Amino acid sequence: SNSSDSSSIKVLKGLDAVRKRPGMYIGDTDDGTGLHHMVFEVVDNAIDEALAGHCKEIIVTIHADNSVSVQDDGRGIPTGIHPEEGVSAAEVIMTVLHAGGKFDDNSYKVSGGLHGVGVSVVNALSQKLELVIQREGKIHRQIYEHGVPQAPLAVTGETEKTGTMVRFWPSLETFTNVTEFEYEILAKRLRELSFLDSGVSIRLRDKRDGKEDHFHYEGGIKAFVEYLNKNKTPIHPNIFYFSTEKDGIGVEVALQWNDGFQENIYCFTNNIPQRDGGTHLAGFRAAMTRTLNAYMDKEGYSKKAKVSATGDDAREGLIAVVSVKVPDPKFSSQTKDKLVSSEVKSAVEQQMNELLAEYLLENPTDAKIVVGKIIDAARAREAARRAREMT
Amino acid sequence: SNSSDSSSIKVLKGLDAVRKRPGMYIGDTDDGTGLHHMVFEVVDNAIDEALAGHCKEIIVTIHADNSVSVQDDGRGIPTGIHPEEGVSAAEVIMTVLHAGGKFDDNSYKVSGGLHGVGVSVVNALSQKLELVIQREGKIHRQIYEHGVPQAPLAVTGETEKTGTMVRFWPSLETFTNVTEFEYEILAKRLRELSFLDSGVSIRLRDKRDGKEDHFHYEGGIKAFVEYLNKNKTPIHPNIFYFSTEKDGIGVEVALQWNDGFQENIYCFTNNIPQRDGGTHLAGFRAAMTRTLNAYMDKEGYSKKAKVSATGDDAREGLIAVVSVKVPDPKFSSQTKDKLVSSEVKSAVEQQMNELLAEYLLENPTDAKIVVGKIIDAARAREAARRAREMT
Ligand SMILES: Nc1ncnc2c1ncn2[C@@H]1O[C@H](COP(=O)(O)OP(=O)(O)NP(=O)(O)O)[C@@H](O)[C@H]1O
Ligand SMILES: Nc1ncnc2c1ncn2[C@@H]1O[C@H](COP(=O)(O)OP(=O)(O)NP(=O)(O)O)[C@@H](O)[C@H]1O
């Protein structure tokens, strides 16, 4: 009719569709976030090996030629010929969307990975990708150029070591504006990951200027909160912390208040951060609001001060880390920005409701100092409300 | 623990990936978000036929059995066998991810659709999908059960009409909790869709209770702003408006302030709404702040008042519709909640900076009034600010 022939229907094979529409896969290819998510897509997979108790060291290097390599010491990507595909499993996971060992809990009981597209997306959006896999006594190597394998995966040598090293050179045909890696952006994620995974040595090297770091904090998310408050001024001594595992879901929370008025809840799901929060954030906020007000009410603070007390008043100056371990998580996007697994909200809420209530009662000084802050917040808030009329 | 062989890696063929990980394709499958998005994936395709100037009526029906059908009087899905797929173009689009006519401007100059995934995702997550294509004098029908054709696309009759009808029954194996359609959620989308597409009769029929709607507004986004403000109180007679197309990007804005204090900015890219905003919102906000502030300064308002006038105060009680019409749009998620194409920010900002400036000049009464509002808001920002940090 109007160029509406059957031939007007174009089918994009292989990785063509991701290069064509990088947005739904990698996110923002302009503001520099999707470019860094490229390093993160690889790292996450290494962290997944760490979760399964395999990888205990990860080395991220920014090279002078504007490429990053992520080397881990896990089991290594499977190298054997695929039973259904005909080429090495290594090649399958790199060239096929929705191909991966994370479609069940057989290789990874709990993992951030689940889409079977992460590393293939990086490979697709890369001018070149070098893959070196050590496992089953052999060193394996394979070079890619825009997702297309240059030769079949080759056994280049012998080794007793196990591991996977993926080095990629992002395609500037995809990424614009921000085209070079930024050390600090990598350092932040890597540092938190270290806090989230004690025992895992994470080294960050920058071959452009020689800078480097070695994150191996062992204090967990409690030390993480301490870190988040370093150039802050916490108002109470006892960081509220708990780590439960109920109905197959793990919820770990560490939090503390400061004298500032900024709210900062860092939410994670199987170590993947949720910029857009989600069900865990929801369960956490509803739980903290119910609990804090419940304490103010039963303790008469609400009565004393006739204070409203809202979530916002409560979250003012809050530094909290909420990490959940979910067997089969759900994300509303490929970049795991929002957690949509409904069952998680209750999981976090139940635990926050019970355990935080306990915290308040067990830590009177802390509870009081915090309640004061809330009341004061509710006061200044409504004072400003009344100040509208009293202009 | 050690489960890592080539057989470990699974490859989800066809629509299995979507059924496996519906989230990265349709979003939240439990709160109703994804459920209604299913309908919207369909409607959008019809709206693109409408943007292409081929569809004038769209009838969306919520059936008693909780299925929804969308009928359009457009070109109809290509029924001709696909050159390389060896199956009808209609079946290709319905069962193959990344297959459609939006990978170029041949069938559609501009279109919200671009992923070649929308309606196949729908079918994938539908326990049943009925397809009826009235094309080239013939009626073509085909039934799918969970993405699988029950029989090839068959010609069932003769016809004088062209159009596409997709009735789908969501899979309860996918969708949970909110599984019944909400008329209001559909009505809102369609009514704004009617505003964005003058000349397209959009009908809503609820076969559960007999409720019906027929949106066919012609005042464009200006009527849209009137509509949005009718429940409120606009403070100035003239709605700011312009429709330009520079550098290949069409940008159309319509705004008006009400004496309230909320900010209601609706952003669309090819009629697709952006809940999370994006580059068009960024440019809009920027140009808005700059223009007004510039006006307040040149007209000496600030030289008297002694205020900074931040955008957030300039946007109080504002209602605006920002519709961009871009060739190759970029979204950071399949659901398209945030536009990431950087070139649109410059586009919206420049256009706004020019015409908004002119508007304040060409419309004094309005300008002084709005500025009056801004002033009171910025002043109140500081009055409330005083009491705020005054206990
Ligand atoms: N460092 C690694 N060590 C071992 N196996 C790896 C590594 N990276 C990738 N793999 C395997 O290859 C797979 C496919 O990886 P990937 O393409 O990135 O998808 P994924 O693991 O499903 N997660 P996601 O980012 O949600 O798409 C995972 O299923 C792992 O089994
Ligand atoms: N009602 C309709 N009328 C005419 N053509 C249609 C209709 N629906 C779908 N089509 C054709 O089939 C296609 C595939 O639709 P779809 O699977 O839903 O992807 P899309 O249009 O690329 N958009 P998106 O949601 O971004 O993936 C479009 O590319 C149209 O050419």
Side-chain angles (χ1 to χ4, degrees), chain B residues 24 48 132 166 171 206-207 218 222 295 299 303 319 371 381 383:
Chain B
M24 73 157 272
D48 289 353
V132 185
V166 170
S171 185
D206 193 354
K207 305 270 270 86
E218 296 184 328
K222 271 199 68 178
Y295 184 82
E299 308 298 324
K303 184 63 189 69
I319 285 187
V371 172
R381 151 182 148 60

PDB file of all heavy atoms in Angstrom, chain B residues 24 48 132 166 171 206-207 218 222 295 299 303 319 371 381 383:
ATOM      1  N   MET B  24      11.789  -7.136  31.766  1.00  0.00           N
ATOM      2  CA  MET B  24      12.582  -6.278  30.884  1.00  0.00           C
ATOM      3  C   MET B  24      11.864  -5.958  29.571  1.00  0.00           C
ATOM      4  O   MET B  24      12.380  -5.211  28.739  1.00  0.00           O
ATOM      5  CB  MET B  24      13.964  -6.898  30.598  1.00  0.00           C
ATOM      6  CG  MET B  24      13.971  -8.091  29.659  1.00  0.00           C
ATOM      7  SD  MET B  24      15.586  -8.365  28.833  1.00  0.00           S
ATOM      8  CE  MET B  24      15.434  -7.340  27.386  1.00  0.00           C
ATOM      9  N   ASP B  48       0.515   4.571  15.324  1.00  0.00           N
ATOM     10  CA  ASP B  48       1.567   4.812  14.333  1.00  0.00           C
ATOM     11  C   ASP B  48       0.960   4.811  12.921  1.00  0.00           C
ATOM     12  O   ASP B  48       1.398   5.556  12.046  1.00  0.00           O
ATOM     13  CB  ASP B  48       2.688   3.771  14.453  1.00  0.00           C
ATOM     14  CG  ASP B  48       3.535   3.957  15.704  1.00  0.00           C
ATOM     15  OD1 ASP B  48       3.350   4.954  16.423  1.00  0.00           O
ATOM     16  OD2 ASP B  48       4.400   3.106  15.974  1.00  0.00           O
ATOM     17  N   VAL B 132      -6.787 -10.480  13.278  1.00  0.00           N
ATOM     18  CA  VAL B 132      -7.616 -10.323  12.091  1.00  0.00           C
ATOM     19  C   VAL B 132      -7.081  -9.118  11.316  1.00  0.00           C
ATOM     20  O   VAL B 132      -7.061  -7.991  11.817  1.00  0.00           O
ATOM     21  CB  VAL B 132      -9.113 -10.105  12.426  1.00  0.00           C
ATOM     22  CG1 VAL B 132      -9.920 -10.082  11.144  1.00  0.00           C
ATOM     23  CG2 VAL B 132      -9.632 -11.199  13.343  1.00  0.00           C
ATOM     24  N   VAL B 166      -6.518  -6.953  16.991  1.00  0.00           N
ATOM     25  CA  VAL B 166      -5.772  -7.864  17.842  1.00  0.00           C
ATOM     26  C   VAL B 166      -6.548  -7.954  19.154  1.00  0.00           C
ATOM     27  O   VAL B 166      -6.779  -6.927  19.821  1.00  0.00           O
ATOM     28  CB  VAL B 166      -4.319  -7.343  18.111  1.00  0.00           C
ATOM     29  CG1 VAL B 166      -3.632  -8.177  19.203  1.00  0.00           C
ATOM     30  CG2 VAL B 166      -3.499  -7.373  16.819  1.00  0.00           C
ATOM     31  N   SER B 171      -1.848 -13.947  29.707  1.00  0.00           N
ATOM     32  CA  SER B 171      -1.533 -15.211  30.350  1.00  0.00           C
ATOM     33  C   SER B 171      -1.483 -15.015  31.857  1.00  0.00           C
ATOM     34  O   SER B 171      -0.715 -14.188  32.360  1.00  0.00           O
ATOM     35  CB  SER B 171      -0.182 -15.730  29.859  1.00  0.00           C
ATOM     36  OG  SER B 171       0.105 -17.019  30.379  1.00  0.00           O
ATOM     37  N   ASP B 206     -16.476  -0.835  27.134  1.00  0.00           N
ATOM     38  CA  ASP B 206     -16.335  -1.779  28.225  1.00  0.00           C
ATOM     39  C   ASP B 206     -17.482  -2.787  28.179  1.00  0.00           C
ATOM     40  O   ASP B 206     -18.588  -2.498  28.630  1.00  0.00           O
ATOM     41  CB  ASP B 206     -16.325  -1.027  29.558  1.00  0.00           C
ATOM     42  CG  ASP B 206     -15.867  -1.886  30.708  1.00  0.00           C
ATOM     43  OD1 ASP B 206     -15.672  -3.100  30.498  1.00  0.00           O
ATOM     44  OD2 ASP B 206     -15.696  -1.352  31.823  1.00  0.00           O
ATOM     45  N   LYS B 207     -17.211  -3.979  27.657  1.00  0.00           N
ATOM     46  CA  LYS B 207     -18.232  -5.026  27.548  1.00  0.00           C
ATOM     47  C   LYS B 207     -18.634  -5.644  28.893  1.00  0.00           C
ATOM     48  O   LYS B 207     -19.433  -6.581  28.942  1.00  0.00           O
ATOM     49  CB  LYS B 207     -17.763  -6.135  26.600  1.00  0.00           C
ATOM     50  CG  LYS B 207     -17.356  -5.658  25.230  1.00  0.00           C
ATOM     51  CD  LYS B 207     -18.514  -5.643  24.258  1.00  0.00           C
ATOM     52  CE  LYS B 207     -18.668  -6.970  23.510  1.00  0.00           C
ATOM     53  NZ  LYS B 207     -19.482  -7.978  24.248  1.00  0.00           N
ATOM     54  N   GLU B 218     -10.215  18.029  18.877  1.00  0.00           N
ATOM     55  CA  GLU B 218      -9.492  18.636  17.769  1.00  0.00           C
ATOM     56  C   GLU B 218      -8.664  19.859  18.132  1.00  0.00           C
ATOM     57  O   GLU B 218      -7.965  20.422  17.287  1.00  0.00           O
ATOM     58  CB  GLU B 218     -10.450  18.981  16.644  1.00  0.00           C
ATOM     59  CG  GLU B 218     -11.102  17.779  16.021  1.00  0.00           C
ATOM     60  CD  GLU B 218     -11.978  18.150  14.850  1.00  0.00           C
ATOM     61  OE1 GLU B 218     -12.562  19.253  14.866  1.00  0.00           O
ATOM     62  OE2 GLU B 218     -12.081  17.336  13.908  1.00  0.00           O
ATOM     63  N   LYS B 222      -3.347  21.964  22.846  1.00  0.00           N
ATOM     64  CA  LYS B 222      -3.834  23.181  23.489  1.00  0.00           C
ATOM     65  C   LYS B 222      -5.146  22.839  24.150  1.00  0.00           C
ATOM     66  O   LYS B 222      -5.398  23.251  25.272  1.00  0.00           O
ATOM     67  CB  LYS B 222      -4.021  24.328  22.510  1.00  0.00           C
ATOM     68  CG  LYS B 222      -2.784  25.178  22.326  1.00  0.00           C
ATOM     69  CD  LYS B 222      -3.128  26.533  21.742  1.00  0.00           C
ATOM     70  CE  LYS B 222      -3.918  27.372  22.731  1.00  0.00           C
ATOM     71  NZ  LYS B 222      -4.223  28.722  22.172  1.00  0.00           N
ATOM     72  N   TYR B 295      13.333  37.376  31.529  1.00  0.00           N
ATOM     73  CA  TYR B 295      12.243  38.340  31.466  1.00  0.00           C
ATOM     74  C   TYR B 295      12.161  39.158  32.746  1.00  0.00           C
ATOM     75  O   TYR B 295      12.026  40.381  32.696  1.00  0.00           O
ATOM     76  CB  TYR B 295      10.910  37.631  31.237  1.00  0.00           C
ATOM     77  CG  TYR B 295       9.739  38.576  31.074  1.00  0.00           C
ATOM     78  CD1 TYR B 295       9.476  39.177  29.844  1.00  0.00           C
ATOM     79  CD2 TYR B 295       8.889  38.861  32.143  1.00  0.00           C
ATOM     80  CE1 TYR B 295       8.397  40.033  29.674  1.00  0.00           C
ATOM     81  CE2 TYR B 295       7.797  39.724  31.983  1.00  0.00           C
ATOM     82  CZ  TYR B 295       7.560  40.305  30.740  1.00  0.00           C
ATOM     83  OH  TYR B 295       6.490  41.150  30.551  1.00  0.00           O
ATOM     84  N   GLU B 299      12.912  43.174  32.526  1.00  0.00           N
ATOM     85  CA  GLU B 299      11.760  43.983  32.884  1.00  0.00           C
ATOM     86  C   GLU B 299      11.900  44.477  34.332  1.00  0.00           C
ATOM     87  O   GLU B 299      10.920  44.867  34.971  1.00  0.00           O
ATOM     88  CB  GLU B 299      10.469  43.184  32.690  1.00  0.00           C
ATOM     89  CG  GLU B 299      10.315  42.544  31.315  1.00  0.00           C
ATOM     90  CD  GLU B 299      10.271  43.550  30.179  1.00  0.00           C
ATOM     91  OE1 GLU B 299       9.692  44.637  30.365  1.00  0.00           O
ATOM     92  OE2 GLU B 299      10.804  43.248  29.089  1.00  0.00           O
ATOM     93  N   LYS B 303      15.142  43.562  40.123  1.00  0.00           N
ATOM     94  CA  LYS B 303      15.794  44.761  40.653  1.00  0.00           C
ATOM     95  C   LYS B 303      14.975  45.386  41.781  1.00  0.00           C
ATOM     96  O   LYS B 303      15.462  46.252  42.510  1.00  0.00           O
ATOM     97  CB  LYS B 303      16.016  45.792  39.540  1.00  0.00           C
ATOM     98  CG  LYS B 303      16.787  47.036  39.977  1.00  0.00           C
ATOM     99  CD  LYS B 303      18.199  46.681  40.427  1.00  0.00           C
ATOM    100  CE  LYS B 303      18.913  47.864  41.062  1.00  0.00           C
ATOM    101  NZ  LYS B 303      18.326  48.242  42.374  1.00  0.00           N
ATOM    102  N   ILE B 319       1.157  23.697  34.058  1.00  0.00           N
ATOM    103  CA  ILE B 319       0.662  22.529  33.360  1.00  0.00           C
ATOM    104  C   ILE B 319       1.170  22.745  31.935  1.00  0.00           C
ATOM    105  O   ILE B 319       0.979  23.814  31.346  1.00  0.00           O
ATOM    106  CB  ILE B 319      -0.877  22.399  33.418  1.00  0.00           C
ATOM    107  CG1 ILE B 319      -1.297  21.933  34.812  1.00  0.00           C
ATOM    108  CG2 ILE B 319      -1.379  21.392  32.373  1.00  0.00           C
ATOM    109  CD1 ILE B 319      -2.760  21.626  34.928  1.00  0.00           C
ATOM    110  N   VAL B 371       4.548  36.133  36.031  1.00  0.00           N
ATOM    111  CA  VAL B 371       5.702  36.642  36.780  1.00  0.00           C
ATOM    112  C   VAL B 371       5.252  36.997  38.192  1.00  0.00           C
ATOM    113  O   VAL B 371       6.007  36.823  39.156  1.00  0.00           O
ATOM    114  CB  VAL B 371       6.330  37.897  36.117  1.00  0.00           C
ATOM    115  CG1 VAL B 371       7.399  38.492  37.027  1.00  0.00           C
ATOM    116  CG2 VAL B 371       6.947  37.528  34.782  1.00  0.00           C
ATOM    117  N   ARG B 381       9.098  30.987  48.957  1.00  0.00           N
ATOM    118  CA  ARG B 381      10.167  30.006  49.097  1.00  0.00           C
ATOM    119  C   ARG B 381      11.082  30.459  50.227  1.00  0.00           C
ATOM    120  O   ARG B 381      11.551  29.640  51.016  1.00  0.00           O
ATOM    121  CB  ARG B 381      10.977  29.872  47.798  1.00  0.00           C
ATOM    122  CG  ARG B 381      12.437  29.458  48.019  1.00  0.00           C
ATOM    123  CD  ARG B 381      13.254  29.364  46.731  1.00  0.00           C
ATOM    124  NE  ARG B 381      14.663  29.722  46.936  1.00  0.00           N
ATOM    125  CZ  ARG B 381      15.504  29.099  47.762  1.00  0.00           C
ATOM    126  NH1 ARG B 381      15.106  28.061  48.488  1.00  0.00           N
ATOM    127  NH2 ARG B 381      16.749  29.539  47.888  1.00  0.00           N
ATOM    128  N   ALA B 383      10.181  32.886  52.626  1.00  0.00           N
ATOM    129  CA  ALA B 383       9.429  33.106  53.858  1.00  0.00           C
ATOM    130  C   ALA B 383       9.394  31.753  54.559  1.00  0.00           C
ATOM    131  O   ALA B 383       9.836  31.619  55.702  1.00  0.00           O
ATOM    132  CB  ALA B 383       8.014  33.583  53.554  1.00  0.00           C
TER     133      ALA B 383
END
